[PDB]
């Protein structure tokens, strides 16, 4: 699949909003995933006890983690589709090392969507909307093939 440049620069206008406050809104979207898909949380032994919305907000290791997703996330938005090298290491460690299934970067991507919709009504109508999910579907397409030739496919 490819995105037009029209359709780049609706995601990346609403990125350039997100960046204003990366370590907020790293927080809304992981909160989101774990309240929404509690399985995830398991993934993270270093998160794995957390029990409440409010634990997790008091979480100064999630915040941080929050803002490295994000900064990797947004590097790879940013170069347009021309982002194989961005994604192999990045697919290497979730697949081998994490063990995170494709099923997961689909909660992921619902909950992105659902932070900028929340916070950016006014840069995230429905064509800005269907371009984020096209650029997340890019995303997930490109991780499905690169773990399959990891041996993995989650
Ligand atoms: C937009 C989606 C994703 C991005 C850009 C992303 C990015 C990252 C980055 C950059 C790290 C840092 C170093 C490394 O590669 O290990 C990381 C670690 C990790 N990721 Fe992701 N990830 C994504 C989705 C997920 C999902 C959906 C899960 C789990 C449900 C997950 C679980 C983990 C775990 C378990 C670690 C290590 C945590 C730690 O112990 O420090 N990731 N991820």
Request: glycine share 6%; proline share 2%.
């Given at each position: 699949?490819?995105?037009?440049?029209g359709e780049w620069q609706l995601?990346?206008?609403?990125?350039?909003?997100?960046?204003?406050?990366?370590?907020?809104?790293?927080?809304?979207?992981?909160?989101?995933?774990?309240?929404?898909?509690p399985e995830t949380l398991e993934?993270?032994?270093?998160?794995?006890?957390?029990?409440?919305?409010?634990?997790?907000?008091?979480?100064?290791?999630?915040?941080?983690?929050?803002?490295?997703?994000?900064?990797?996330?947004?590097?790879?938005?940013?170069?347009?589709?021309?982002?194989?090298?961005?994604?192999?290491?990045?697919?290497?460690?979730?697949?081998?090392?994490?063990?995170?299934?494709?099923?997961?970067?689909?909660?992921?991507?619902?909950?992105?969507?659902?932070?900028?919709?929340?916070?950016?009504?006014?840069?995230?109508?429905?064509?800005?909307?269907?371009?984020?999910?096209?650029?997340?579907?890019?995303?997930?397409?490109?991780?499905?093939?690169?773990?399959?030739?990891?041996?993995?496919?989650?």
């Open positions: 699949m490819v995105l037009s440049e995601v990346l206008h609403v990125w350039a909003k997100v960046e204003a406050d990366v370590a907020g809104h790293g927080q809304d979207i992981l909160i989101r995933l774990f309240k929404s898909h993934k993270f032994d270093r998160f794995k006890h957390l029990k409440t919305e409010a634990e997790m907000k008091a979480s100064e290791d999630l915040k941080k983690h929050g803002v490295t997703v994000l900064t990797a996330l947004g590097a790879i938005l940013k170069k347009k589709g021309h982002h194989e090298a961005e994604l192999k290491p990045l697919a290497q460690s979730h697949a081998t090392k994490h063990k995170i299934p494709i099923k997961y970067l689909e909660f992921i991507s619902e909950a992105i969507i659902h932070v900028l919709h929340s916070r950016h009504p006014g840069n995230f109508g429905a064509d800005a909307q269907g371009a984020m999910n096209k650029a997340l579907e890019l995303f997930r397409k490109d991780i499905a093939a690169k773990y399959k030739e990891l041996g993995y496919q989650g």
